[PDB]
Structure formats: structure tokens, C-alpha cells
């Protein structure tokens, strides 16, 4: 009976089903005849002769007169640098017109953006105007600007991911998610800068820009003036873009009601810029006039996730975000301030006072948060951890803790923190990978006493930035 | 979605370069 057969098939990958065609001629027909079920093609990596036969399989089987079928996910990547060109050429030349690719992950690093555009245009298999999502791990080039022409060519495109692995030399209401990941070594420019500053992208829910170099010559770019163009921006991730600064970003947050809602923010400058402090200075135009309204609260009120890893933010700046209640504290549920050198704790004796993070004030403000990340924070010595011990009652919602890659924190602080936490029913998760001072017997006692449900102790794991999971800075 | 793996490039005397200025 035909009704059951998609239900059998769809629990099995396209490749596995295509191999399952060889069980017998009857089942060959059963599988081959249900075109709709092959909703993914994870071909990557593939050689050209194999790709020719895949395309031939489309030309034989999928090429129905009636215009029905579409594909939810096509992933193409060449096994060979030259065959990259041949595969892309054949793809845009021979894809059956009646059948539409919904989402295209065309992972072709040698291809220039110009060649991609030209191949779409002369190929004429116009699904590329009609696909829903596009991802291009490709070579950049600065002169032709054709990476903008892609969007203008593909008005149905909602999610775009440009991954500029290499370099060589208007309203966009459709767009909902933009990812721009750039190899910081190679991409010595900002590819979408003119488009981002001139155009508007009103539907845009998420933006994710990493590795680009903000040009010095245009202060409007450095002052995030373009960033005003995207209201309703539920998530903002911005990382390792060398010439950006949190300092300028917080001016934009000061002087405009730039967003009605951010659910999440993730700002990560790479180098140690000068000490940034929350600029609570509220000037008046004249004493006989009103002050400027400081829009920090209405911008930042909505945040569920605040990530500021490495951003040189001073501890007092973060306390002022809490005391002013610019951060709501109830809406906020996860916080990352790892690698921030300008964070000191009240138990320390050698600092300027404005670098102190009053964890008691802060934890009293934002108490119901679920996840904390203080990874790489050398300043979190064992003495400073005593602040967390005495502040356990103000963090009882915490499930997931990352303090990994800290070369100071002894297992002593881990044990007394967890013993005090256990006075709340263990902690769900703890990350102490790369920490040199977390004694083996201590962590094994932690497991044996079951003080943490899961604790990670890969001493040999040198790095924290799991690509795609923890960071979008490229490789 | 994937972190890169390196592969050795190679250069040879292409006709385009032979027809450069």
C-alpha cells in the first residue's frame, strides 16, 4: 500500500534509501517512485563524476512534467579544488527547472563570489531566485561587490550565511537572519559595510558578524551608526572584529532608543582597548532645559542572555548596569563575562576601585539566572571565590557554570563552593577544562560524592572556542 | 557551519598569465 511507504522511508537518510533501491527490483520501484521523500542531499564532499551521476539521477527521476517537488536541504562541497568549478557549473546549468531547492549550503571555498553570481545568471535554472536559505563558504573579492547582488538576485532569501574563508583580487524585507563569518587573517575589509549602512533590513531577527575589520576612514561605521538600521533585532552576536569597540557601542546604547527588544547580546572585541566605564554622565543642554534621556534601560531591559567575553568592561560598569537596573535581572537568565581583565572581586587588595565587580550587589539584582561563564578569568583566584561561597543564596537558579581555562583556581574553591551549593540536589553542570590547579583526587571526590551531576576536567584541552557552539569567529 | 582544513595550493604557467601584459 502506497500510504505507508513515506512513513517507512522518511526515517532513513536519502543516501541510505538510494542504496536500499538495490534490495530488489520491486522495492527499487517502490523507493524510486516516491520523489517527495528525498528531502535532504548531504552530498559533501563529492567528486565530479559522482556529482554528474547524482545530477543525472535528477534528470531521470525528479524531472516530472508537473511542477511539484522541492528539496529542504542541499549540501554541496567538492572533493577537489578544480572540480569545485565543474560541480557548480553543472549545478546551475542542469538542475531540473520544475524542482526547487529550498535551502542551499554551497560550501565551495575556491569559488569567488563573482563566479557564483555569474554562474547563477548564465545557468538560468532560476531556483536561485526562489530558494529560502543560502550558505556560501567562498572566496571574497573586494572590487565587484557581487555578494550584495546575491540578495538582490534572491528576493525569497530569509537566512544568509557568508563564510569568507579567503580573499582574492533599498529595502530587504525578506531577510530574517544574517551571518557574516570572516577569516580575520585574510578579510582585511568589511564586505557588507556599504549595504549595511545604506540599506534597511526590517524583518531581521538575528545578526551575526565576526572577523571583519571596521574601516578607520568612516567613523560612522566605528560608531555603529549603521546598526540603527535594524529594529526588532532579537539577537545580536558580534565577535573578533578587530577595530570595533565596546566603548563606541555603549555610546549608541546611550543616545538612542535603538531597539524595542533584544533578547540576546554577544559583543566580543579581541584586543585590550582602554578601560570602558558605564557613561552615566547625563548632560544638560542648558540648566534652563531638560537633560538628554539616556536610553540604556529601554535598550537593554529585554536581555535574556548577555555575553561580554573579553570586552575590557570594568567591574563597576557591570555593577552600574545592575544598580541602575538597565539590565532587568528577572528577564536576564544567562551571563558570560569571561576573559575580561578589568573585573576584580571585593577580596582583592591591589586595584583601582572602579574595576571591582560587587558580586553581592549584582547577584542580588539578577538572582534567577541559570548559566554563568567566567572562563579565562584569571582574576577569579581562590580568595575571590570566597565571595561566591558567601553569595550562594543569591544564585540558587544556577545550573550551568563555566570557569574553565583558569590557571589559578585551585580545587579547594571548587569543593567549598560545591559543598555550600549543596546546602540548597547537585549542580547540573560544571566546566573546568584546561585548569591546571584542579587536583585529580578532588575532582574524583566531586564525582564520588556526586556534588556535580556532570563535571568536565579535560586538562589537555588547550582552547575554549568550539566553532559554531561557543564562537562564530572563524577557525 | 564547519571549521576549515588546509590543502596545499599549487601554481603553474596558465595561458592567462602568459597573455598578461
Amino acid at each position: 500500500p502506497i500510504e505507508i511507504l513515506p512513513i517507512i522511508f522518511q526515517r532513513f537518510t536519502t543516501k541510505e534509501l538510494v542504496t536500499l533501491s538495490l534490495v530488489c527490483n520491486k522495492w527499487r520501484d517502490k523507493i524510486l517512485y516516491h520523489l517527495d521523500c528525498f528531502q535532504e542531499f548531504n552530498l559533501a564532499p563529492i567528486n565530479f563524476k559522482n556529482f554528474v551521476k547524482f545530477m543525472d539521477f535528477l534528470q531521470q527521476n525528479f524531472t516530472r512534467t508537473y511542477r511539484k517537488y522541492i528539496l529542504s536541504q542541499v549540501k554541496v562541497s567538492s572533493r577537489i579544488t578544480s572540480e569545485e568549478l565543474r560541480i557548480t557549473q553543472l549545478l546551475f546549468s542542469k538542475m531540473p527547472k520544475c524542482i526547487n531547492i529550498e535551502r542551499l549550503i554551497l560550501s565551495m571555498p575556491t569559488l569567488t563570489t563573482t563566479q557564483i553570481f555569474k554562474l547563477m545568471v548564465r545557468g538560468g535554472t532560476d531556483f536561485f531566485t526562489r530558494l529560502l536559505e543560502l550558505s556560501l563558504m567562498i572566496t571574497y573579492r573586494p572590487d565587484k561587490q557581487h555578494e550584495l547582488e546575491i540578495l538582490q538576485t534572491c528576493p525569497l532569501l530569509k537566512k544568509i550565511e557568508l563564510i569568507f574563508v579567503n580573499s582574492l583580487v533599498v529595502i530587504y524585507s525578506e531577510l530574517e537572519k544574517i551571518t557574516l563569518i570572516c577569516d580575520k587573517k585574510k578579510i582585511k575589509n568589511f564586505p557588507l559595510c556599504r549595504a549595511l549602512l545604506r540599506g534597511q533590513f526590517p524583518l531581521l531577527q538575528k545578526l551575526t558578524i565576526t572577523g571583519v575589520t571596521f574601516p578607520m576612514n568612516n567613523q560612522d561605521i566605528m560608531n555603529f551608526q549603521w546598526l540603527l538600521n535594524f529594529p526588532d533585532l532579537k539577537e545580536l552576536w558580534i565577535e573578533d572584529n578587530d577595530n570595533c569597540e565596546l566603548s563606541k557601542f555603549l555610546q549608541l546604547l546611550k543616545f538612542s532608543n535603538v531597539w524595542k527588544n533584544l533578547e540576546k547580546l554577544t559583543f566580543r572585541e579581541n584586543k585590550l582597548y582602554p578601560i570602558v566605564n558605564l557613561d552615566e554622565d547625563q548632560p544638560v543642554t542648558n540648566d534652563d532645559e531638560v537633560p538628554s534621556m539616556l536610553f540604556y534601560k529601554e535598550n537593554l531591559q529585554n536581555l535574556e542572555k548577555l555575553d561580554l567575553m573579553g570586552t575590557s568592561i570594568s567591574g563597576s560598569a557591570l555593577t552600574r548596569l545592575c544598580e541602575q537596573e538597565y539590565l532587568d535581572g528577572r528577564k536576564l537568565r544567562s551571563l558570560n563575562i569571561g576573559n575580561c581583565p578589568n573585573i576584580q572581586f571585593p577580596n582583592n587588595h591591589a586595584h583601582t576601585a572602579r574595576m571591582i565587580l560587587d558580586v553581592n550587589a549584582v547577584l542580588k539584582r539578577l538572582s534567577k539566572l541559570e548559566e554563568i561563564n567566567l572562563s579565562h578569568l584569571s582574576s577569579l583566584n581562590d580568595s575571590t571565590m570566597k565571595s561566591f561561597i558567601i553569595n550562594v543564596p543569591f544564585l540558587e537558579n544556577l545550573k550551568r557554570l563555566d570557569i574553565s581555562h583558569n590557571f589559578e583556581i585551585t580545587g579547594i574553591s571548587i569543593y567549598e563552593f560545591l559543598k555550600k551549593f549543596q546546602m540548597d540536589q547537585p549542580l547540573a553542570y560544571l566546566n573546568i577544562d584546561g585548569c591546571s590547579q584542579v587536583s585529580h583526587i578532588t575532582v574524583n571526590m566531586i564525582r564520588a560524592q556526586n556534588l556535580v551531576t556532570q563535571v568536565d576536567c579535560v586538562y589537555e584541552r588547550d582552547v575554549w572556542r568550539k566553532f559554531g557552539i561557543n564562537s562564530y569567529s572563524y577557525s | 557551519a564547519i571549521t576549515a582544513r588546509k590543502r596545499r595550493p599549487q601554481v603553474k604557467l596558465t595561458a592567462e598569465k602568459l597573455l598578461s601584459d
Binding site: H349, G411, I412, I414, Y415, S439, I441, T442 | -
Partner: protein, 105 residues
């Protein structure tokens, strides 16, 4: 036993010992003010205290025998307690030294 669990108890017990025999706190501050005065007008004394094993025995025989038999586990928390005391005195690791009645050692 894992030392890190009982480390806090050993720190606070040696802090109680330091409070009990205040002459050690007085010596810590004497060292600090001498160094401050030598810095004040252009000699330096070291961050070291000689504690009596007799005082520590009368305070806590269990801790004292821990110092004698297991110094690798009892000296670092005692020196941490001393360092915290020196840090609590107004405005670098401090070290311990020992005198008296070692017996079989």
C-alpha cells in the same frame, strides 16, 4: 582523603591559632610598619614568621601533629591563613618558620 576538602577547615583553624596567640599578629604588623617606614623616606624585612610548635601543640595537638607528620598538607593552608592575616592588616605570599621541641624529628 582529598586535602582540598579539609583545606578550609585547616585555614580557619590556623587563623584561630593566630588570633589565640596575638604575638604573631603583632609581629606581622611590626614587619609591615618597619617596611612601610623604610619605604616612606629614602633594610627591608622578609615576609616570614617563626611560630612556636609548643603554642600550636597546646592550641590543637591534631593540627600540630599534622604539621610534623604531614607538612605538605598542613603548611600551605597555615601559610595561606598567615597571608590572609597579613592582608587583613592595613595596606605577596607570607612564609612560616618553626621552633621548639621537635622530639623524634
Amino acid at each position: 582523603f582529598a586535602p582540598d576538602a579539609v583545606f578550609g577547615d585547616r585555614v580557619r583553624r590556623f587563623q584561630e591559632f593566630l588570633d589565640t596567640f596575638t604575638s604573631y599578629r603583632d609581629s606581622v604588623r611590626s614587619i609591615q610598619v618597619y617596611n612601610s617606614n623604610n619605604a616612606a623616606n629614602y633594610n627591608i624585612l622578609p615576609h616570614r614568621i617563626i611560630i612556636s610548635l609548643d603554642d600550636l601543640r597546646e592550641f590543637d595537638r591534631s593540627f600540630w601533629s599534622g604539621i610534623l607528620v604531614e607538612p605538605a598538607y598542613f603548611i600551605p593552608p597555615a601559610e595561606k591563613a598567615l597571608t590572609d592575616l597579613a592582608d587583613s592588616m592595613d595596606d605577596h605570599p607570607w612564609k612560616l618558620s618553626f621552633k621548639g621541641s621537635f622530639g623524634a624529628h
